[PDB]
Motif scaffolding. Structure first.
Motif, PDB file in Angstrom:
ATOM      1  N   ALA A   1      -1.250  -2.984  11.146  1.00  0.00           N
ATOM      2  CA  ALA A   1      -1.482  -3.096   9.715  1.00  0.00           C
ATOM      3  C   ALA A   1      -0.187  -2.704   9.005  1.00  0.00           C
ATOM      4  O   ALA A   1       0.256  -3.384   8.089  1.00  0.00           O
ATOM      5  CB  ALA A   1      -2.627  -2.174   9.288  1.00  0.00           C
ATOM      6  N   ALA A   2       0.423  -1.607   9.449  1.00  0.00           N
ATOM      7  CA  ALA A   2       1.663  -1.129   8.848  1.00  0.00           C
ATOM      8  C   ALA A   2       2.734  -2.206   8.937  1.00  0.00           C
ATOM      9  O   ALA A   2       3.440  -2.469   7.972  1.00  0.00           O
ATOM     10  CB  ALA A   2       2.139   0.140   9.552  1.00  0.00           C
TER      11      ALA A   2
ATOM     12  N   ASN B   1      -8.253   4.135   4.887  1.00  0.00           N
ATOM     13  CA  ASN B   1      -8.169   2.844   4.205  1.00  0.00           C
ATOM     14  C   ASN B   1      -7.026   1.993   4.726  1.00  0.00           C
ATOM     15  O   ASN B   1      -6.818   0.876   4.269  1.00  0.00           O
ATOM     16  CB  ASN B   1      -7.990   3.078   2.712  1.00  0.00           C
ATOM     17  N   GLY B   2      -6.284   2.534   5.685  1.00  0.00           N
ATOM     18  CA  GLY B   2      -5.165   1.804   6.242  1.00  0.00           C
ATOM     19  C   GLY B   2      -3.877   2.575   6.060  1.00  0.00           C
ATOM     20  O   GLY B   2      -3.869   3.650   5.456  1.00  0.00           O
ATOM     21  N   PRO B   3      -2.760   2.041   6.565  1.00  0.00           N
ATOM     22  CA  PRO B   3      -1.457   2.698   6.452  1.00  0.00           C
ATOM     23  C   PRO B   3      -0.961   2.618   5.016  1.00  0.00           C
ATOM     24  O   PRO B   3      -1.165   1.612   4.341  1.00  0.00           O
ATOM     25  CB  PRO B   3      -0.592   1.882   7.404  1.00  0.00           C
ATOM     26  N   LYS B   4      -0.327   3.682   4.546  1.00  0.00           N
ATOM     27  CA  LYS B   4       0.211   3.701   3.192  1.00  0.00           C
ATOM     28  C   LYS B   4       1.573   4.378   3.216  1.00  0.00           C
ATOM     29  O   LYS B   4       1.771   5.374   3.915  1.00  0.00           O
ATOM     30  CB  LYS B   4      -0.729   4.444   2.239  1.00  0.00           C
TER      31      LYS B   4
ATOM     32  N   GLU C   1      -4.128  -0.883  15.793  1.00  0.00           N
ATOM     33  CA  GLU C   1      -4.568  -1.619  14.613  1.00  0.00           C
ATOM     34  C   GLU C   1      -3.851  -1.049  13.396  1.00  0.00           C
ATOM     35  O   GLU C   1      -3.367  -1.790  12.555  1.00  0.00           O
ATOM     36  CB  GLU C   1      -6.086  -1.503  14.418  1.00  0.00           C
ATOM     37  N   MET C   2      -3.783   0.275  13.313  1.00  0.00           N
ATOM     38  CA  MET C   2      -3.104   0.938  12.199  1.00  0.00           C
ATOM     39  C   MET C   2      -1.634   0.523  12.243  1.00  0.00           C
ATOM     40  O   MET C   2      -1.032   0.180  11.221  1.00  0.00           O
ATOM     41  CB  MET C   2      -3.223   2.457  12.353  1.00  0.00           C
TER      42      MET C   2
ATOM     43  N   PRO D   1       0.772  -1.249   0.000  1.00  0.00           N
ATOM     44  CA  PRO D   1       0.000   0.000   0.000  1.00  0.00           C
ATOM     45  C   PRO D   1       0.800   1.295   0.000  1.00  0.00           C
ATOM     46  O   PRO D   1       1.559   1.566   0.925  1.00  0.00           O
ATOM     47  CB  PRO D   1      -0.884  -0.137   1.242  1.00  0.00           C
TER      48      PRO D   1
ATOM     49  N   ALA E   1      -1.470   7.352   8.041  1.00  0.00           N
ATOM     50  CA  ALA E   1      -2.589   6.549   8.481  1.00  0.00           C
ATOM     51  C   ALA E   1      -3.811   7.108   7.782  1.00  0.00           C
ATOM     52  O   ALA E   1      -4.296   8.174   8.147  1.00  0.00           O
ATOM     53  CB  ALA E   1      -2.746   6.665   9.984  1.00  0.00           C
TER      54      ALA E   1
ATOM     55  N   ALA F   1       1.405  -5.295   6.557  1.00  0.00           N
ATOM     56  CA  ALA F   1       1.107  -5.019   5.152  1.00  0.00           C
ATOM     57  C   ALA F   1       2.205  -4.197   4.493  1.00  0.00           C
ATOM     58  O   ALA F   1       2.282  -4.123   3.268  1.00  0.00           O
ATOM     59  CB  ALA F   1      -0.227  -4.293   5.021  1.00  0.00           C
TER      60      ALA F   1
END
Length: 413
Positions: free
Chosen positions: A239-240, A272-275, A235-236, A117, A269, A243
């Protein structure tokens, strides 16, 4: 027992050295080239970071058991490769692996191939193709000329893309324009020790990129930071880690570019999530100044564990840490040096004063770089850290320095 060498000259290196100096495994500590402030915790070695040939000899002659690289420059130049070829233990990425930071184009290439991502990215030399692309992505959208405009409408985006190609620099491949996805959210720095596929997450931190209060002005290497970052959910964070960080390490390895050292992910953050915004192949500055003081685990021991691919449980203090950068007026633009810095001796012994660009002369301190210093304070809460920090900062007198007053404002408010 161990002779450790740290490569660099800024606050991050002062932080690295400071921490390593507290290791019961460290017999002697050197920093090349370091700076006046750093000399208080380690012996300075007058060798340039890029003078890799000389650094090698020094390492061999000074029986250096562990070398830790601070800045990107030596890494991009292959210091790691040279050291390993010389059988010298060094914590940092090979030139190939360092490309993760060296070329954003490469980073985007890798992340796209491996589905990691990140904000969309694309370069064009042809207006028509840029146009077709812009119209497919809608606005807001980011146009970057070779300068950066966050176009609010597709129309503006097209005007800016055209201008970028028409007035931008004429490269050997002609003029080019970069179009990036505009992302919204909370920015955060996620660092982790990495060795091949094994990732060891470090505590999260938040940088303050813009030069002025209320994040105004041009971008900088970082005007301040703090850790932890309450507003970033676990959670973020998780996810990082799963993902982004883990897949990135595995990607680099799969591409024949296994990474060793500190993988620093400049993330955002989003809903849609961490990018990924940016990847860095080493400790961030000033992230190191605020993350290392929260590290209870011995850094040297931690680094060796990572290098041996051993399991490791990093421990962190509950205390928050916030640091504020003092830069020379004009930074990140043109700035002057030679401004006398007074009051450094008035700072509480509990304050962490990391030197980044100072000079000692005739028994006095002088500004000697863009980012000159950073004062960080520990606190039971981020609010207490911020208070203690700015409190101490006021004791410093120098009409040649300036600093944001809103470091940590996002976490507090």
């Amino acid at each position: 027992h161990m002779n450790v060498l740290v490569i660099g000259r800024g606050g991050r290196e002062h932080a690295i050295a400071w921490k390593a100096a507290q290791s019961p495994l460290v017999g002697k500590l050197y920093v090349a080239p370091g700076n006046p402030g750093i000399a208080d915790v380690a012996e300075l070695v007058h060798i340039d970071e890029l003078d890799i040939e000389a650094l090698v000899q020094f390492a061999k002659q000074q029986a250096i058991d562990l070398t830790i690289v601070g800045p990107e420059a030596p890494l991009a130049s292959g210091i790691v490769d040279r050291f390993m070829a010389e059988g010298l233990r060094i914590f940092g990425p090979s030139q190939r692996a360092a490309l993760i930071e060296g070329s954003k184009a490469f980073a985007k290439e890798l992340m796209k191939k491996y589905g990691i991502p990140t904000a969309d990215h694309a370069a064009f030399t042809s207006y028509e193709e840029a146009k077709a692309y812009i119209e497919q992505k809608g606005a807001p959208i980011v146009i970057k000329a070779d300068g950066v405009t966050v176009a609010q409408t597709v129309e503006e985006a097209l005007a800016a893309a055209k201008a970028a190609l028409v007035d931008g620099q004429f490269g050997t491949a002609g003029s080019q324009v970069v179009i990036e996805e505009y992302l919204e959210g909370e920015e955060f720095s996620f660092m982790a020790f990495v060795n091949g596929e094994k990732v060891y997450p470090l505590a999260i931190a938040q940088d303050h990129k813009r030069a002025y209060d209320g994040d105004e002005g041009p971008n900088t290497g970082g005007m301040g930071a703090y850790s932890p970052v309450p507003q970033i959910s676990d959670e973020m964070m998780d996810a990082a880690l799963e993902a982004i960080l883990r897949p990135a390490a595995k990607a680099l390895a799969a591409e024949g570019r296994p990474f060793l050292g500190v993988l620093y992910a400049g993330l955002m953050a989003t809903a849609n999530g961490p990018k990924v915004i940016e990847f860095n192949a080493r400790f961030g500055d000033p992230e190191a100044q605020v993350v290392l003081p929260r590290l209870k685990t011995d850094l040297v021991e931690a680094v060796l564990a990572v290098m041996d691919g051993k399991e490791l449980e990093l421990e962190w203090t509950d205390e928050a840490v916030l640091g504020v950068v003092l830069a020379a007026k004009g930074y990140p633009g043109a700035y002057e040096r030679g401004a006398e810095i007074r009051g450094l001796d008035r700072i509480s012994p509990d304050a962490l004063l990391f030197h980044a660009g100072t000079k000692r002369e005739g028994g006095a301190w002088y500004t000697n770089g863009g980012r000159v210093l950073l004062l960080a304070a520990k606190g039971e809460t981020l609010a207490k850290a911020k208070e203690k920090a700015y409190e101490q900062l006021a004791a410093i007198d120098c009409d040649g320095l300036f600093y944001r007053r809103d470091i940590g404002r996002r976490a507090i408010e």
